[PDB]
Design an enzyme around this catalytic site. Structure first.
Site, PDB file in Angstrom:
ATOM      1  N   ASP A 108      -8.894  34.026  42.789  1.00  0.00           N
ATOM      2  CA  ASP A 108      -9.446  32.705  43.234  1.00  0.00           C
ATOM      3  C   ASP A 108      -8.357  31.842  43.900  1.00  0.00           C
ATOM      4  O   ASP A 108      -7.524  31.216  43.249  1.00  0.00           O
ATOM      5  CB  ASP A 108      -9.994  31.960  42.005  1.00  0.00           C
ATOM      6  CG  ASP A 108     -10.583  30.580  42.334  1.00  0.00           C
ATOM      7  OD1 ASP A 108     -10.821  30.300  43.557  1.00  0.00           O
ATOM      8  OD2 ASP A 108     -10.854  29.806  41.357  1.00  0.00           O
ATOM      9  N   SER A 167      -9.604  23.139  61.011  1.00  0.00           N
ATOM     10  CA  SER A 167     -10.253  23.923  62.086  1.00  0.00           C
ATOM     11  C   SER A 167     -10.401  23.015  63.346  1.00  0.00           C
ATOM     12  O   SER A 167     -10.670  21.788  63.268  1.00  0.00           O
ATOM     13  CB  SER A 167     -11.610  24.407  61.613  1.00  0.00           C
ATOM     14  OG  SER A 167     -12.367  25.031  62.670  1.00  0.00           O
TER      15      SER A 167
HETATM   16  C1  LIG Z   1      -7.726  22.844  38.910  1.00  0.00           C
HETATM   17  C2  LIG Z   1      -9.206  22.833  39.084  1.00  0.00           C
HETATM   18  C3  LIG Z   1      -9.594  23.359  40.477  1.00  0.00           C
HETATM   19  C4  LIG Z   1      -9.489  22.269  41.519  1.00  0.00           C
HETATM   20  C5  LIG Z   1     -10.992  23.909  40.513  1.00  0.00           C
HETATM   21  N1  LIG Z   1     -11.408  24.580  41.732  1.00  0.00           N
HETATM   22  C6  LIG Z   1     -12.731  24.821  41.923  1.00  0.00           C
HETATM   23  O1  LIG Z   1     -13.609  24.348  41.202  1.00  0.00           O
HETATM   24  C7  LIG Z   1     -13.149  25.723  43.065  1.00  0.00           C
HETATM   25  P1  LIG Z   1     -13.201  27.468  42.630  1.00  0.00           P
HETATM   26  O2  LIG Z   1     -13.334  28.315  43.830  1.00  0.00           O
HETATM   27  O3  LIG Z   1     -11.932  27.713  41.824  1.00  0.00           O
HETATM   28  C8  LIG Z   1     -14.663  27.809  41.595  1.00  0.00           C
HETATM   29  C9  LIG Z   1     -14.513  29.155  40.806  1.00  0.00           C
HETATM   30  C10 LIG Z   1     -15.719  29.623  39.951  1.00  0.00           C
HETATM   31  C11 LIG Z   1     -15.414  31.035  39.381  1.00  0.00           C
HETATM   32  C12 LIG Z   1     -16.128  28.634  38.875  1.00  0.00           C
HETATM   33  N2  LIG Z   1     -15.894  27.670  42.353  1.00  0.00           N
HETATM   34  C13 LIG Z   1     -16.906  26.824  42.125  1.00  0.00           C
HETATM   35  O4  LIG Z   1     -16.902  25.942  41.249  1.00  0.00           O
HETATM   36  C14 LIG Z   1     -18.134  26.921  43.045  1.00  0.00           C
HETATM   37  C15 LIG Z   1     -18.703  25.517  43.228  1.00  0.00           C
HETATM   38  C16 LIG Z   1     -17.800  24.513  43.895  1.00  0.00           C
HETATM   39  C17 LIG Z   1     -16.630  24.653  44.574  1.00  0.00           C
HETATM   40  N3  LIG Z   1     -16.209  23.410  44.995  1.00  0.00           N
HETATM   41  C18 LIG Z   1     -17.116  22.493  44.609  1.00  0.00           C
HETATM   42  N4  LIG Z   1     -18.082  23.124  43.952  1.00  0.00           N
HETATM   43  N5  LIG Z   1     -19.025  27.944  42.457  1.00  0.00           N
HETATM   44  C19 LIG Z   1     -19.572  28.932  43.208  1.00  0.00           C
HETATM   45  O5  LIG Z   1     -19.496  29.045  44.469  1.00  0.00           O
HETATM   46  C20 LIG Z   1     -20.311  30.069  42.458  1.00  0.00           C
HETATM   47  C21 LIG Z   1     -19.412  31.259  42.179  1.00  0.00           C
HETATM   48  C22 LIG Z   1     -19.767  32.348  41.207  1.00  0.00           C
HETATM   49  C23 LIG Z   1     -20.872  33.175  41.359  1.00  0.00           C
HETATM   50  C24 LIG Z   1     -21.201  34.181  40.486  1.00  0.00           C
HETATM   51  C25 LIG Z   1     -20.435  34.396  39.359  1.00  0.00           C
HETATM   52  C26 LIG Z   1     -19.318  33.597  39.183  1.00  0.00           C
HETATM   53  C27 LIG Z   1     -18.971  32.612  40.085  1.00  0.00           C
HETATM   54  N6  LIG Z   1     -21.508  30.472  43.262  1.00  0.00           N
HETATM   55  C28 LIG Z   1     -22.588  29.685  43.376  1.00  0.00           C
HETATM   56  O6  LIG Z   1     -22.847  28.627  42.802  1.00  0.00           O
HETATM   57  O7  LIG Z   1     -23.488  30.275  44.315  1.00  0.00           O
HETATM   58  C29 LIG Z   1     -24.784  29.767  44.685  1.00  0.00           C
HETATM   59  C30 LIG Z   1     -24.567  28.406  45.346  1.00  0.00           C
HETATM   60  C31 LIG Z   1     -25.333  30.767  45.714  1.00  0.00           C
HETATM   61  C32 LIG Z   1     -25.757  29.779  43.510  1.00  0.00           C
END
Ligand SMILES: CC[C@H](C)CNC(=O)CP(=O)(O)[C@H](CC(C)C)NC(=O)[C@H](Cc1c[nH]c[nH+]1)NC(=O)[C@H](Cc1ccccc1)NC(=O)OC(C)(C)C
Length: 329
Positions: free
Chosen positions: A35, A198
């Site tokens: 990630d 971009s």
């Molecule tokens: C220190 C904290 C950091 C700043 C946190 N960073 C993040 O939250 C972004 P990330 O890419 O690490 C994080 C990882 C996930 C494994 C939980 N992604 C997310 O939180 C994003 C939502 C998001 C991103 N930004 C704002 N909202 N989630 C997603 O995109 C999840 C991923 C997934 C799917 C299946 C199984 C596991 C994981 N997919 C998802 O929600 O897909 C549909 C919209 C189609 C239903």
């Protein structure tokens, strides 16, 4: 030294990708979500509350090289509202033949319901900048930061597949894995992400609009999230598409032949095929499909997630001044 490991979609929709990781002595193999949008290496473990475990677990007391990091704790939450927390070991970690000694391995005491519910993901391996790591009182380095002293070059590459296996490489650029040349663009680390600007976009066979779009390269997010005016211009070219309040984004007929979407990297152009923008049916057998391009208004940041990155060969250059490279493939 170098490493090379195979990454595989977890399901038929490409919701996420898993990569094998060897932890401890003798090696315990777990499948982790690599990630580039976070900076913690955390795992399901022998410490995790038993009712919240459905996954392969790490057992530190079976590893001769595990050391407890005295006093250290961690706690993280993600954009989709998921979370986890626990204590910290240092241990030997290998990815694709590349071995790091002394890596922080964050052992979960508790995980949220969305992690319990996903049988295929045994934890996360973060690849953003180490300033976002959640260990207290002293933050811990990522696997990439610990590997840089030994690597043949301070780089890693992501080559994600469309409903197919792909590759993460550490320490070298495989010139046979892409077409044309790589174009590099500046990175800002002020928010801890691989953040870049971009140069603009085009829909299908129409005109390229030069409008700056600030966003992050994020392998842990499934979809492509862009400004409301840009997303409206894309779905205006799809005759059945409409915004659905109840489903939570743009929906359209699965029988549509979708236009491509092109984004700018300096003077260069990356083309996302229309088929990549069809995420899949809202439920098995539905005539309605969910869009792979959605508005970033509710997130507050633009996100180049898996829909965009799987159309490119992507170079994460971790020299002292970092840069991001993109090539067609
Ligand atoms: C220190 C904290 C950091 C700043 C946190 N960073 C993040 O939250 C972004 P990330 O890419 O690490 C994080 C990882 C996930 C494994 C939980 N992604 C997310 O939180 C994003 C939502 C998001 C991103 N930004 C704002 N909202 N989630 C997603 O995109 C999840 C991923 C997934 C799917 C299946 C199984 C596991 C994981 N997919 C998802 O929600 O897909 C549909 C919209 C189609 C239903």
């Amino acid at each position: 030294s170098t490493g090379s490991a195979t990454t595989t979609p977890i399901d038929s929709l490409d919701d996420a990708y898993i990569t094998p990781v060897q932890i401890g002595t003798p090696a315990q193999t777990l499948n982790l979500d690599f990630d580039t949008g976070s900076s913690d290496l955390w795992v399901f473990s022998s410490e995790t509350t038993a009712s919240e475990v459905x996954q392969t677990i790490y057992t530190p007391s079976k590893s001769t090289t595990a050391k407890l990091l005295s006093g250290a704790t961690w706690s993280i939450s993600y954009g989709d509202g998921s979370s986890s927390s626990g204590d910290v070991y240092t241990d030997t970690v290998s990815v694709g033949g590349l071995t790091v000694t002394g890596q922080a391995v964050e052992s979960a005491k508790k995980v949220s319901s969305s992690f319990t519910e996903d049988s295929t993901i045994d934890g996360l391996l973060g690849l953003a900048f180490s300033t976002l790591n959640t260990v207290s009182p002293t933050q811990q380095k990522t696997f990439f930061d610990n590997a840089k002293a030994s690597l043949d070059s301070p780089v890693f590459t992501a080559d994600l597949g469309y409903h197919a296996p792909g590759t993460y490489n550490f320490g070298f650029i495989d010139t046979t894995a892409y077409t044309g040349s790589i174009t590099y663009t500046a990175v800002s680390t002020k928010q801890g992400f691989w953040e870049w600007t971009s140069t603009g976009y085009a829909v299908g066979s129409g005109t390229f609009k030069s409008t700056s779009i600030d966003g992050i390269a994020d392998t842990g997010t499934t979809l492509l999230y862009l400004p409301a005016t840009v997303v409206s211009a894309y779905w205006a070219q799809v005759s059945g598409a409409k915004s659905s309040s109840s489903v939570g984004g743009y929906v359209f007929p699965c029988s549509a032949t979708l236009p491509s979407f092109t984004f700018g990297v300096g003077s260069a152009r990356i083309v996302i095929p229309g088929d990549y923008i069809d995420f899949g049916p809202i439920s098995t057998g539905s005539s309605s499909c969910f869009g792979g391009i959605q508005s970033s208004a509710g997130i507050g940041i633009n996100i180049f997630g898996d829909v965009a990155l799987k159309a490119a060969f992507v170079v994460f250059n971790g020299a002292t001044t970092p840069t991001l490279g993109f090539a067609s493939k």
